[PDB]
Amino acid sequence: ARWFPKTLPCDVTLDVSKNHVIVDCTDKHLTEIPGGIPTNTTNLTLTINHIPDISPASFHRLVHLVEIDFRCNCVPIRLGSKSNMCPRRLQIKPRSFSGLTYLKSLYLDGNQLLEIPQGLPPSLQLLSLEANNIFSIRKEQLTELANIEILYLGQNCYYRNPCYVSYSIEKDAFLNLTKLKVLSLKDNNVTTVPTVLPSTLTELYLYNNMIAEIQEDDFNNLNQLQILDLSGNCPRCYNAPFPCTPCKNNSPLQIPVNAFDALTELKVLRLHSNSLQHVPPRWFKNINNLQELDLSQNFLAKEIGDAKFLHFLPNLIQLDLSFNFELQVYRASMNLSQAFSSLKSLKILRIRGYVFKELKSFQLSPLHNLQNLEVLDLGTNFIKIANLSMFKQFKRLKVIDLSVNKISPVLEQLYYFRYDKYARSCSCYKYGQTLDLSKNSIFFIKSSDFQHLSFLKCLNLSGNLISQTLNGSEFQPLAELRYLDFSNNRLDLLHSTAFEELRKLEVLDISSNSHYFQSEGITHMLNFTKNLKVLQKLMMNDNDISSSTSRTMESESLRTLEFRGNHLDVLWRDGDNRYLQLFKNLLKLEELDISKNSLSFLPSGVFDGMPPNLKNLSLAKNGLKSFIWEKLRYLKNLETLDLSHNQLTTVPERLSNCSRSLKNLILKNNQIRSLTKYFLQDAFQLRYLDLSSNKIQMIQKTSFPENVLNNLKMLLLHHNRFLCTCDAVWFVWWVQHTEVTIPYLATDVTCVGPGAHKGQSVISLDLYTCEL
Amino acid sequence: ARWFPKTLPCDVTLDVSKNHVIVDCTDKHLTEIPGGIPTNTTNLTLTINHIPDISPASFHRLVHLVEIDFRCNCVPIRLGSKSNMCPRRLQIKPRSFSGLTYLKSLYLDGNQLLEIPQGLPPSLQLLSLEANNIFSIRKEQLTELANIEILYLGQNCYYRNPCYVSYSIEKDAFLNLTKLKVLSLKDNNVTTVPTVLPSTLTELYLYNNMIAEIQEDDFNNLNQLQILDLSGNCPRCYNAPFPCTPCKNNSPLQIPVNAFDALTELKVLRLHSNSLQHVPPRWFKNINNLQELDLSQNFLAKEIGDAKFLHFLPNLIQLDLSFNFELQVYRASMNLSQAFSSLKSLKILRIRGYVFKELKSFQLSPLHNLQNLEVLDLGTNFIKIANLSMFKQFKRLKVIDLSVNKISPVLEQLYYFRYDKYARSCSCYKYGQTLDLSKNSIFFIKSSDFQHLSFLKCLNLSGNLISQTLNGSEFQPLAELRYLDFSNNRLDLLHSTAFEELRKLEVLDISSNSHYFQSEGITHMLNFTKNLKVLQKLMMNDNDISSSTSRTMESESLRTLEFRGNHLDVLWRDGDNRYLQLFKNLLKLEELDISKNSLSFLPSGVFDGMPPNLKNLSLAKNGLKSFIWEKLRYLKNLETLDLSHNQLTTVPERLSNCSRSLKNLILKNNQIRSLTKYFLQDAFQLRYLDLSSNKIQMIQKTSFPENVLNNLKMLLLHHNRFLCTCDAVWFVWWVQHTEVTIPYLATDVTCVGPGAHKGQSVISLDLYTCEL
Ligand SMILES: *[C@@H]1O[C@H](CO)[C@@H](O[C@@H]2O[C@H](CO)[C@@H](O[C@@H]3O[C@H](CO)[C@@H](O)[C@H](O)[C@@H]3O)[C@H](O)[C@H]2NC(C)=O)[C@H](O)[C@H]1NC(C)=O
Ligand SMILES: *[C@@H]1O[C@H](CO)[C@@H](O[C@@H]2O[C@H](CO)[C@@H](O[C@@H]3O[C@H](CO)[C@@H](O)[C@H](O)[C@@H]3O)[C@H](O)[C@H]2NC(C)=O)[C@H](O)[C@H]1NC(C)=O
Ligand SMILES: *[C@@H]1O[C@H](CO)[C@@H](O[C@@H]2O[C@H](CO)[C@@H](O)[C@H](O)[C@H]2NC(C)=O)[C@H](O)[C@H]1NC(C)=O
Ligand SMILES: COCCOc1nc(N)c2[nH]c(=O)n(Cc3cccnc3)c2n1
Ligand SMILES: COCCOc1nc(N)c2[nH]c(=O)n(Cc3cccnc3)c2n1
Ligand SMILES: *[C@@H]1O[C@H](CO)[C@@H](O)[C@H](O)[C@H]1NC(C)=O
Ligand SMILES: *[C@@H]1O[C@H](CO)[C@@H](O)[C@H](O)[C@H]1NC(C)=O
Ligand SMILES: *[C@@H]1O[C@H](CO)[C@@H](O)[C@H](O)[C@H]1NC(C)=O
Ligand SMILES: *[C@@H]1O[C@H](CO)[C@@H](O)[C@H](O)[C@H]1NC(C)=O
Ligand SMILES: *[C@@H]1O[C@H](CO)[C@@H](O)[C@H](O)[C@H]1NC(C)=O
Ligand SMILES: *[C@@H]1O[C@H](CO)[C@@H](O)[C@H](O)[C@H]1NC(C)=O
Ligand SMILES: *[C@@H]1O[C@H](CO)[C@@H](O)[C@H](O)[C@H]1NC(C)=O
Ligand SMILES: *[C@@H]1O[C@H](CO)[C@@H](O)[C@H](O)[C@H]1NC(C)=O
Ligand SMILES: *[C@@H]1O[C@H](CO)[C@@H](O)[C@H](O)[C@H]1NC(C)=O
Ligand SMILES: *[C@@H]1O[C@H](CO)[C@@H](O)[C@H](O)[C@H]1NC(C)=O
Ligand SMILES: *[C@@H]1O[C@H](CO)[C@@H](O)[C@H](O)[C@H]1NC(C)=O
């Protein structure tokens, strides 16, 4: 099927449309650029390898290169592996790039470079040197970069990669770079805005530096600028989870009132962590087009009650005023200026970390006529009291977020508090209007709590204290609710009428409600499913369920059930027939996850008792030691079977004789030592087979007939114990010459023996000695 | 040191005191009795093996045998392994035991025997045949057993091991067994008390059977009987987690009022799950000696309010009235008869599962003058209200257990609800008075809640909802408290004055309080430790701690700190110096557990920052990929180092050069392929080394000097990848001939190669071919 075996340890791809030949050698444990890279190669990635030098030899033949990604072949000591520390900085010999006449992008981040590589081609539009040790920019070193448009110089002098001096930039160093659009000098220990900058800039990044003061003419020429970020100059250092040095005298970043006058094109201004106490209106006099403004992590509590600057921002889309609270203060209420009412275009308003006791309807009144408001985020406020019915005046919003509060009767997990949330390394919103009440102190709920909230489509109660015997009378107003997250509560299923009032509920998550399921001889009515007539998906993961008062769960509607991390091993105790039909009457059930249920065996009757339309079944992570494959005959619509992370030692004698329907078979991380003689014979329906991370030594043609193999979308064999004797000749040949996709042929499909070939990739194996 | 190597795959022991020669071959995957068992052998255990027959060959030479334990060499289908099902019942050929003239004990449980083995010696005092398929007892088959004293016949016909008929016992079958003390017929599908039974019985077990009626003369002769168990005849089957058939018409076990009249010696009567509605006083008329009475899992709610029978039990020590609640009733209060006051000797009273709303002081007044009462257990009652101050009238008690209740302002997990709680397979109490409030609905605490409980030594608040910013004012009355379990709450460490009122606190568990540590940019004062002047032990496991407002924890008292399952990897982010002395000022700290903290490496500064008296350090389960062993020089009092379950690939060149103090080194479950040339040279302090579950191939003499080996209490090498070539000659000899204790030389110290010796124990290896 292939005349010449692909032997290069890099994935290769044609996007013939854009004459792109893409060679990806990301993380292949290489110490040399591999031989025999295609001449027509356009994009070459050599990221995360241990290649110690670049020379004219490196790219000699590859003249059609438009991109070289050579990131992290020597990452700074503190950012990189400590088990494989890079010994010495990447060596770049002269004339290494001057050849590459079509080169448009060059990434040399995280290689401990001391200086900007010279002799670069004039075609270059983008050059990235983040996380090197370049902390002085001279005009002379930048002349090569005439046609440059995007320049990343950040992370060259900061706490993870220290240089122990101030960043230095020569006067007018970037001025003659007349096509420069994006300049990033973030995380560099910079002390003044470099001037003069080319007027051609669209984006300027100066955050996480030691800039104390903005000169009034620092941004005078930048009349094309759209994004400016001055964040984390004079940072607010309270509970900073990085080392943090504030400007002395508790001073803020000092910004002349007329500093932004030139920036008529500005769309995004970021002044996060600048220790601001006031926001002068005068800043925003000649910027009417500002859309995104970040004023998070300042000291603007008082200002939020005033905020005259808001009158000048009628086009603003996003406003962030999060974490402005005064240290040592627990305000009684949120004091929002009337000025908020002048934010005609506002779609998103975030004010986390204001920190106040009580939210009352009136206090949100400035927001009442903001027609386009879509998100209100009042998370992490330690609010103790909130009549949720106030949100009746907010039907128009997509999300009301009261997450992480103390109420009782998306973003990255570390978003506001991480150092560089945009650092490069080496959900129920879609159902409609969402009230996120997660991680609060709600211990008791009743119908009136939700009075006037009929419009809600998703309600997130995850992470509360609800410890109550729901009888179908608690959620009565929520006649439109489609999704309920009840995870991390203490559901008590005394009554099978639980949740039945939610007449349109499509998704119910009662995962991690193990409290009442963890105790012996308490009633649990798992048959509560019957009343929920439109329920598509039920999650009851990690409930530690080992007893049930009802013998059968029933739904005419339910399609997916996650039952992971329970104790079906106890319910199906060998000899106890009573629960072998627990899922049988879930008639439309298509997907069942019963992984992590300690099922070391399956009692007979388990497969017979499965509902008749089951398609996707997980029995992963069960410590299964044995498995009657023949019983798969009962599962007449089975498509996907996940037996990953078990202790199976064998496969069936004939898989076609086990199931006619089975497409996707996952057997990874088992103890399988050898295949049956005619394993896959006549199994024409099979499309995906994972046998990775087993202990297979031989694979003969009888077990792996070609007329089954050649229909496989994918076939995983890596991390086995392959013996490369002459007996293995068919398999070695077949691997080397097959079209079928087999991940990790470079990295992890390898001979353990005999002696001679130990550690050697089978892709590379010369077995001519078997043919003399 | 040893002239003749022990090759036998069984532990062997001399207890010279009791002329015992003890050969334990428990679970050695044997298919034959091994050769070369000592002639002087007295106790031979061959439990859990696959030995398919016994014959006169079996025990030929072993005439001094007093005990043969041969349990579970063929366990019934539903009780045993499904990966290694026993094919065929154990075969006992004639005259197999008749030789063994001193044989006093024979255990043949779980071997699928069809009949009572004949030709047994007349010395036999104990015979166990549990979990075979013997369900008809005939007088003739029992004549061999004249001198028998203890006879276990249970579990031969029940749901896990069915026989599909009634158990049958011939009239007077056991009568001529004139020395019989203990007869167990539990779990046998018995239909009537077998009569007549020898008067010589001390203990009779008939529980879990189909006995519907006791005839009034069924126990007439048994005037030496001490224990009687009739439990689970006519069971209460509500929430039963085994298959359960009740007597028709919900009838009870019917017991003539005079059924116990002969039993003047009875000490323990067990009537668990007999569906009793009334407890006739007349039962206890001629039993003044009764000490333990189990009336759990009946229908005795009403009776508890009356209970005239109690007046006849002034010697009773233990009373169990648990799980007597009426189905579908939630009583308002617990109605305890005054009669309880006549239980002069009572030490333990359990009434779980009465199921009531409100507990008031007066309701316990019958118990007020029970001088010897030590334990009151009112767990699993769904109590919503209890003025804890009522327990001021109970300072004499050791434990007050309100575990698993719904209060707000040891025993097996499956104790009352498992089938046979005495089925054979193949804590802060010691501090003083304990109030267990675990798994309740307490969301808020304040001082007055504990008014008049100054006498408490331990308080268990584990598993509540406490979600509050403890400021030192919540526990003020608990002046004597020594132990607090605050695990599985939601501790908010806003204030470093948390817990400071508990001035005599020696142990504080704040484990699994991860809630407020899981959210970003919240204050956490870990330095709260400073105020607790006598605190010996702090547990703050699984708190998912990745940030702290304080840079140092401090204590002059603290000796043990468990910090397992947190994120020190984030606090010690490479480049962040601020938390490297987090434990330094815990001056008396001797033990630190920082396992499960995702520490793939240890930043420099960590060992320098450890407190000066650290003795016992765990870094287990961290995914450590590297380790600077030299840094152990900073830990000048280190005795135990646990590096188990990591990814270390190398040991130090010389361990003596790394620490002078180190006694116990645990390296198990790592990736170590070889030892350094002089690894253990001059390591005179070393006493315990575990190198098990690594990938070691060779061990040369240089690495393992004899003057270090011969001080080792224990040395673990099992589950490595030992190569048994001629190069391995020293190691093989040394293993075979050393005194040093090396567990699993039989089971798991094994050659992987070469070809010839694959799978072979190194203990057994003959390498004379390397000496010709
Ligand atoms: C960012 O730039 C600043 C300064 O522009 C760097 O701070 C400087 O760092 C060095 C070494 O940390 C300090 O020098 C020291 O002086 C003392 C004498 O008191 C001497 O004992 C030391 O051995 C060393 O020579 C220098 O004073 C300090 N300057 C200031 C104003 O703090 C900083 O390290 C740079 N940041 C990064 C992350 O590279
Ligand atoms: C304990 O003993 C009882 C009675 O001594 C056994 O119950 C009996 O079980 C047998 C076998 O299942 C039943 O006979 C069968 O009847 C069905 C009709 O239902 C027939 O089609 C079968 O071919 C067979 O002949 C019998 O119904 C039943 N008797 C009673 C009174 O329930 C029971 O099996 C024993 N339990 C255990 C765990 O050994
Ligand atoms: C191959 O290299 C080219 C050149 O660096 C990449 O082209 C850029 O793609 C980005 C994002 O997809 C565009 O917005 C830029 O405008 C492109 N620049 C130029 C000059 O062409 C291309 O993405 C690379 N592809 C792969 C798969 O590596
Ligand atoms: C002690 O066991 C009784 C079992 O009944 C049981 N199971 C729950 N999950 C229960 N949850 C619960 O509140 N109760 C109290 C109750 C009991 C009866 C009627 N009404 C309320 C619960 N009782
Ligand atoms: C989001 O920033 C809030 C400051 O940190 C913080 N951390 C807790 N664990 C806190 N827990 C808490 O109740 N608050 C609010 C508060 C503040 C001041 C005085 N009393 C209460 C908390 N505030
Ligand atoms: C709200 O804010 C303004 C300005 O900071 C203040 O003067 C006013 O009194 C505040 N009102 C309340 C109720 O806090
Ligand atoms: C509910 O909130 C939790 C915790 O904040 C979050 O992890 C979960 O995804 C949310 N649920 C949905 C359905 O959005
Ligand atoms: C669930 O099972 C119980 C127990 O028999 C029954 O009373 C109840 O009506 C069932 N509930 C539903 C909603 O099907
Ligand atoms: C050895 O057998 C005797 C008689 O059965 C018994 O009393 C003793 O417990 C046994 N000892 C051990 C430790 O096996
Ligand atoms: C308690 O129960 C007994 C028996 O049911 C009844 O006779 C008695 O009157 C009850 N007493 C109280 C105080 O409820
Ligand atoms: C609880 O009883 C105590 C003393 O036994 C009394 O001081 C107190 O008022 C009672 N408290 C409540 C809340 O019932
Ligand atoms: C407190 O109760 C829990 C379970 O209810 C138990 O695991 C724990 O050990 C108890 N605490 C102590 C200190 O014994
Ligand atoms: C601690 O909290 C209690 C109850 O909320 C309060 O009465 C007390 O004064 C607080 N202590 C301090 C120092 O604020
Ligand atoms: C803990 O740290 C804080 C903040 O530095 C300090 O104010 C507080 O008093 C310290 N507490 C103790 C008990 O040392
Ligand atoms: C060391 O600490 C572990 C962790 O609990 C403990 O189990 C072990 O006994 C300790 N050993 C010594 C000798 O201190
Ligand atoms: C380690 O070895 C060298 C040479 O023996 C010696 O100078 C040094 O003091 C040693 N360190 C310790 C802790 O013994």
**Nearest Cα residue to B55 out of B22, B33, B27:** B33
Residue A639 near residue A667 (C-beta atoms within 8 A):
no
Q: Please report the DSSP string for B321-337 in residue order.
A: --S-PPTT--BSS----
Q: Name the residue with the closest Cα to ligand 14, atom 9.
A: B496
The answer to whether A122 and A146 have CB atoms below 8 angstroms apart is yes
At B571, give phi and psi (nearest 5°).
Answer: -60, -35
- d(CA B112, ligand 2 centre) in Å: 20
Q: Which two tokens stand for residue A389?
A: 């019915």
**Beta-strand runs (E) in B412-487:** 434-436, 458-460, 483-485
Q: How many residues does chain B have?
A: 772
Contact A103, A80 (CB under 8 A): no
CA distance A209 to A635: 62
CB A560 within 8 A of CB A529: no
One-letter-per-residue 3-state SS of B692-760: CCCCCCCCCHHHCCHHHHCCCCEEECCCCCEECCHHHHHHHHHHHHCCCCCCCCCCCCEEEECHHHCCC
φ/ψ of B205, rounded to 5, equals -115, 110
Quote the CA–CA distance of B429 and B400 in Å, as a whole number: 10
Q: Which amino acid is at B299?
A: F
Cα A662 to Cα A685: distance, rounded to the nearest angstrom: 6
Cα–Cα distance list, B225 to A670, B222, B261, B271, B317 (Å): 55, 5, 12, 16, 18
Q: Is A739 on the interface with B (CB under 8 A)?
A: no
DSSP secondary structure string for all residues of B353-420:
T--BSEE-GGGGGGGTT-TT--EEE--SS---EE-GGGGGGGTT-SEEE--S--------TTSSSSS-
Q: Which atom of ligand 8 is nearest to the CA of A527?
A: 1
Q: Which H or E element spans position A303?
A: helix A301-304
DSSP secondary structure letter of residue B179: T
The torsion angle over the Cα atoms of residues A69, A74, A77 and A78, rounded to 10 degrees, is 20
Question: Are B601 and B622 a contacting pair, CB within 8 Å?
Answer: no
Of B443, B546, B573, the CB nearest to A443: B443
Task: State how far the Cα of A130 lies from the Cα of A152, in Å rounded to an integer.
Answer: 6
Distance of alpha carbon A110 from alpha carbon A72, whole angstroms? 5
Could you tell me the distance, in angstroms and rounded to a whole number, from the CA of residue B382 to the centre of ligand 4? 7
Residues 255-284 of A with CB under 8 A from B: none
Place of tokens 């069960």: A622
CB of A496 sitting under 6 A from ligand 8: yes
Of residues B363, B366, B361, B367, the one with CA closest to residue B389: B361
Contacts of B675 (CB under 8 A, 6+ apart): B651, B691, B696, B699, B700, B703, B704
The H or E element that residue A694 is part of is none
Cβ-contact A103, A65 below 8 angstroms: yes
Identity of the residue in B243, B443, B521 whose CB atom sits nearest the CB atom of A353: B521
How many other C-beta atoms can be found within 10 angstroms of the C-beta atom of residue A77?
Answer: 15
Helix (H) or strand (E) holding B571: helix B568-571
Helices assigned H by DSSP within B198-316: 301-304
SS3 label, residue B450: helix
Closest to B475 measured CA to CA, from B458, B500, B496:
B500
For ligand 4, mutation pick of B355, B357, B408 (most atoms within 8 Å of CB): B355
In the block, which residue shows the tokens 């152990």?
B632
In degrees rounded to 5, what are phi and psi of residue B215? Answer: -65, 145
Distances (CA, A) of A526 to A230, A410, A517, A546: 56, 33, 11, 12
Instruction: Return the residue of A nearest to B406 by Cα.
Output: A467
Binding residues of A for guanosine: 382, 406, 492, 523
Both tokens of B303, joined, read: 């009776």
Whether A578 sits inside 8 A of B243 (CB atoms) is yes
**Ligand 5 centroid to A167 CA: how many Å?**
38
| Nominal resolution (angstroms) | 2.8
Neighbour count for residue B571 (Cβ, 10 Å): 21
- Cα–Cα distance for residue pair B202/B227, rounded to 1 Å: 6
Contact between B464 and B489 under an 8 Å Cβ cutoff? The reply is yes
Contact partners, residue A156, CB within 8 Å, separation at least 6: A129, A130, A131, A132, A133, A134, A135, A163, A167, A187, A188
A549 to chain B, minimum CA–CA distance in Å? 6
Write the burial class of residue A7 (CB in 10 Å: 0-12 exposed, 13-18 middle, 19+ buried): middle
3-state secondary structure of A459: strand
A203: which 2 tokens? 């984006």
Map residue B636 onto helix, strand or coil. coil
Can you tell me the distance from the alpha carbon of A353 to that of A748, in angstroms, rounded to the nearest whole number? 48
Amino acid at A295: L
Q: Which is it for strands B227-229 and B203-205: parallel, antiparallel or unpaired?
A: parallel
Give the position of tokens 């086009």.
A315
DSSP-assigned letters across all residues of A117-185: --S--TT--EEE-TTSS--EE-GGGGGGGTT--EEE--SSSBTTB--SS--EE-TTTTTT-TT--EEE-
SS (H, E, C) B546-569: CCCCCCCCEECCCCEEECCCCCHH
Which chain A residues are Cβ-neighbours of B463 within 8 angstroms? 515
Interface of A with B in 633-692 (CB under 8 A): none
Distance in angstroms (rounded) separating the CA atoms of residues A142 and A168: 14
Q: CA-CA distance, B749 to B215, in Å (whole number)?
A: 60
Q: Based on the number of CB atoms within 10 Å of its own CB, is A103 exposed (0-12), middle (13-18) or buried (19 or more)?
A: buried
Given ligand 9 and candidates B10, B66, B70, B124, which is best to mutate, with the most ligand atoms within 8 Å of its CB?
B66
Q: Which of A360, A436, A364, A424 is nearest to A400 (CA)?
A: A436
CA distance A187 to B748: 54
- Which one of A520, A550, A578 makes the best mutation probe of the B interface by having the most chain B beta carbons within 10 Å? A520
Residue whose tokens read 């509060």: A405
Which ligand 13 atom is nearest residue B446's CA? 4
- Candidate of B277, B299, B306 to mutate for ligand 10, largest count of ligand atoms within 8 Å of Cβ: B306
Beta-carbon count within 10 A of A259 CB = 21
Residue nearest to atom 11 of ligand 11 (CA): B387
Shortest CA distance from A626: residue in chain B: B83
Beta-carbon contacts of residue B545 (< 8 Å; ≥ 6 apart): B514, B517, B524, B526, B563, B566, B567, B568, B571
Q: H or E stretch including A708? A: helix A706-709
The residue whose CA has the least distance to atom 3 of ligand 4 is: A522
Binding site, annotated residues of A for Ca(2+): 766
Asked if A339 contacts A313 with a C-beta cutoff of 8 angstroms, the reply is no
| Cβ-contact A92, A72 below 8 angstroms | no
Cβ-Cβ contacts under 8 Å, B519 against chain A: 380, 404, 439
For residue A406, the chain B residues in CB contact (below 8 A) are: 467
Atom 8 in ligand 6: residue holding the nearest Cα: A305
Q: Which two three-digit tokens encode residue B274?
A: 């007999």
Nearest partner of B207 among B227, B181, B178, judged by Cα = B227
The torsion defined by the Cα of B347, B352, B358 and B363, in degrees rounded to 10, comes to: -30
Owner of token pair 């329906």: A685
According to DSSP, the residues that pair with A69 across neighbouring strands are A45, A107
Instruction: Please state the three-class secondary structure of A717-751 as a single string.
Output: CCCCCEECCHHHHHHHHHHHHCCCECCCCCCCCEE
- Measured CA to CA, the distance from residue B470 to residue A70 in angstroms comes to 53
Torsion of CA A741, A742, A747, A750, to 10 degrees: -150
- Among B574, B517, B506, CA closest to B543: B517
Residue A357 forms contact with B (CB below 8 Å): no
- Chain A / chain B CB contacts < 8 angstroms: 125
CB B358 within 8 A of CB B364: no
Q: Which amino acid is at B30?
A: L
Task: State how far the Cα of B545 lies from the Cα of A412, in Å rounded to an integer.
Answer: 18
Quick check: helix, strand or coil at residue A190?
Answer: coil
DSSP string, B517-549: GSSSS----GGGGGG-TT--EEE-TT------S
CA angle B349, B355, B359 (to 5 degrees): 70
Q: A563, A593 in Cβ contact below 8 A?
A: yes
**Pairwise CA distance, residues B54 & B72, whole Å:** 13
Instruction: Give the SS3 label for residue A248.
Output: helix
Interface subset of B 143-202, CB within 8 angstroms of A: 159-162
Instruction: Break chain B down into helix, strand, coil percent, rounded to 5.
Output: 15, 15, 70
Phi, psi of B589, deg, nearest 5: -65, 125
Closest chain A residue to the Cα of B324, Cα to Cα? A521
In angstroms, the CA B378 to CA B399 distance is: 11
Beta strands A483-485 and B20-24, pairing class? unpaired
The preferred substitution site among B527, B531, B554 for testing ligand 14, maximizing ligand atoms within 8 Å of CB, is: B527
Nearest-angstrom CA–CA distance, A124 and A107: 11
B570, containing H or E segment? helix B568-571
Q: Whose CA is nearest to atom 7 of ligand 14?
A: B496
Q: How many residues does chain A have?
A: 772
Task: At A623, give phi and psi (nearest 5°).
Answer: 60, 30
Per DSSP, the residues of A320-379 read E--S-PPTT--BSS----GGGGG-TT--EEE--S--BSEE-GGGGGGGTT-TT--EEE--
Nearest Cα of chain A lies from the Cα of B643 at a distance, in angstroms, of: 16
Distance B511 CA to ligand 12 centre (A): 12
With CB atoms and an 8 Å threshold, state whether B546 touches A404: no
| CB atoms A82 and B160 under 8 Å | no
A369 contact partners, CB below 8 Å, separation of at least 6: A341
Q: Label each residue of A578-625 as H, E or C.
A: CCCCCCCEECCCCEEECCCCCCCCCCCCCCCCCCCCCCEEECCCCCCC
Phi/psi-derived region of residue A63, left when phi > 0, alpha when psi is between -120 and 50, beta in every other case: alpha
Give the residue from chain A lying closest to B462, CA to CA.
Answer: A515
Distance CA A11, CA A13 (A): 7
Greatest distance between any 2 Cα atoms in chain A? 92
Indicate the helix (H) or strand (E) that contains A706: helix A706-709
Cis previous bond, B196, omega within 30: yes
The residues near B523 (Cβ < 8 Å, ≥ 6 apart) are A239, B493, B494, B549
d(CA A244, CA A189): 12
| Half-sphere exposure in the Cβ direction for B390 (13 Å, CA) | 16
User: Which residues in chain A have Cβ-Cβ distances shorter than 8 Å to B78?
Assistant: 574-575
Q: Which residues contact B91 (CB under 8 A, 6 or more apart)?
A: B52, B53, B54
Q: Which helix (H) or strand (E) holds A633?
A: none
CB nearest B239 (choices: A161, A323, A547): A547
DSSP category for residue A246: P
Specify the residue with its C-alpha closest to ligand 1, atom 30: A165
CA distance B472 to A650: 61
Q: Which of B160, B578, B600 sits opposite A243 (nearest CB)?
A: B578
CA distance B495 to B478: 20
**Tokens 């009230």, residue?**
A435
Task: Scan residues 310-349 of B and list those with Cβ closer than 8 Å to A.
Answer: 323
CA angle in degrees (0–180, nearest 5) for B751-B757-B759? 55
Interface test with A, best of B75, B83, B650 (most A CBs within 10 A): B83
Facing B83 at nearest CB: one of A241, A575, A626: A626
Report, in angstroms and rounded to the nearest whole number, the Rg of chain B calculated over CA atoms: 32
Contact A255, A278 (CB under 8 A): no
In contact, A577 and A551? CB cutoff 8 Å? no
Distance separating alpha carbons of residues A355 and A341, to the nearest angstrom: 22
B441 lies within 8 A of chain A by CB: yes
